[PDB]
Design brief:
The structure is a homodimer. Chain A is an alpha+beta fold. The first copy, chain A, folds into two domains: 79 residues, Glutaredoxin (3-Layer(aba) Sandwich); 139 residues, Glutathione S-transferase Yfyf (Class Pi), Chain A, domain 2. Chains A and B meet through β4, α3, α4 and α6 of A and β4, α3, α4 and α6 of B. Chain A: GO terms for molecular function: glutathione transferase activity. Chain A: Keywords: Transferase. Chain A: One of its GO terms (cellular component) is cytoplasm.
Chain lengths: 218, 217
């Protein structure tokens, strides 16, 4: 009875999708690309993807959605038992989002759509990513997972942000962030071996041509 | 036994300060400006303010700190009891943070420190802010509070973000965002009358010369 609005090329969508799959929860996928059309803003108020549809209405923002899922749904816990530990997962998830994912996102135009980004935007992304990766190294436990010895929400934000950020690094900035961050390199391969990953990546590939056609027309 | 690390000119610090005061919680303030010095990064890993020191260690990020306080501390609830309602408060808080506070912050250099910002940065902030305010208008309930009829965490992010964003709008962009947002103008005046606001403001004024001095060197 949960519905997830988004598209399988979206990293933030894939984070929720993995959480639902990891938890063995039933959900229906609805193709939805967000954006600024008036009808789209009625579902997602800033036009972001994904959106969770519940009996009570829509929730947007991956971080918010994941917290609602933990609280309300059955299946494998994706948080530690203790309050401080939960806040530490959430601190790490937030850091990856604001200090790795968002700055990398400023360069997705160039890295994925072959459209060069302003030099001022590149400079800022390089400084922001260097700091974001430094923050993750300093604050992350990587034991092997981000926050410690168990898979948590922060590993979802890690595994679908750090891949894209490293692509931006190599293609746009001439920096391999993971070359000198072996903790992170090892976790990324580990998350790559999650039993639900083949389905996520298969759906992504299957969805890619429509996504690109949507881009091409708009 | 809780300690709050930060400085009274910081809007993120003041949000957590107001939460602690409103819940009647005991806390010590510790002057801390974050930043990129090695000893500061040992406290706050990205160098942001504020940081809460607990029995178990440090927590950074206002949104994270507020949630931790709500989960562990006594006093007046700043969230509704139901999980969907709580998520909606957090959605509203996140939206104010990401789509109003952060784009405004890109122009603080100009609005507050008299250092003119690049045209690219200015125009991006204008577009982000118009979109952030539109998002707040469409998603917020303002009944009279952001999320409905009771004060919640989202009102903390609202009252310490929208003020500075409107200052940015007027000074840097020649846009008065609140001029066509009567719900938000009324709520900002209401939050202004909170009995802890005089203390917050007076502490801010008292702390400004040391803050600016830290900046000059």
């Amino acid at each position: 009875s949960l519905k997830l609005y988004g598209f399988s090329v979206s990293n933030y969508y894939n984070m929720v999708k993995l959480a639902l799959l990891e938890k063995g929860l039933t959900f229906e996928e609805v193709t939805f690309y967000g954006g600024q059309a008036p009808q789209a803003l009625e579902v997602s108020p800033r036009g972001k993807v994904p959106v969770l549809e519940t009996e009570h209405g829509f929730l947007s923002e991956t971080s918010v959605i994941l917290d609602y899922i933990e609280q309300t749904q059955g299946g494998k816990a994706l948080l530690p038992a203790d309050p401080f530990g939960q806040a530490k997962v959430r601190e790490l998830l937030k850091e990856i989002e604001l200090y790795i994912e968002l700055p990398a996102r400023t360069c997705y135009a160039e890295s994925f759509f072959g459209m060069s980004v302003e030099p001022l935007i590149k400079e800022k992304a390089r400084a922001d990513l260097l700091a974001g990766f430094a923050t993750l190294k300093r604050n992350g436990r990587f034991a092997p997972y981000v926050a410690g010895e168990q898979l948590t929400l922060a590993d979802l934000m890690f595994c679908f942000s750090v891949d894209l950020a490293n692509a931006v690094g190599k293609k746009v900035l001439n920096i391999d962030f993971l070359a000198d961050f072996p903790q992170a390199k090892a976790l990324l391969q580990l998350m790559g071996e999650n039993p639900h990953m083949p389905r996520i990546l298969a759906d992504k590939e299957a969805s890619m041509p429509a996504f690109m056609e949507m881009i091409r027309s708009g």
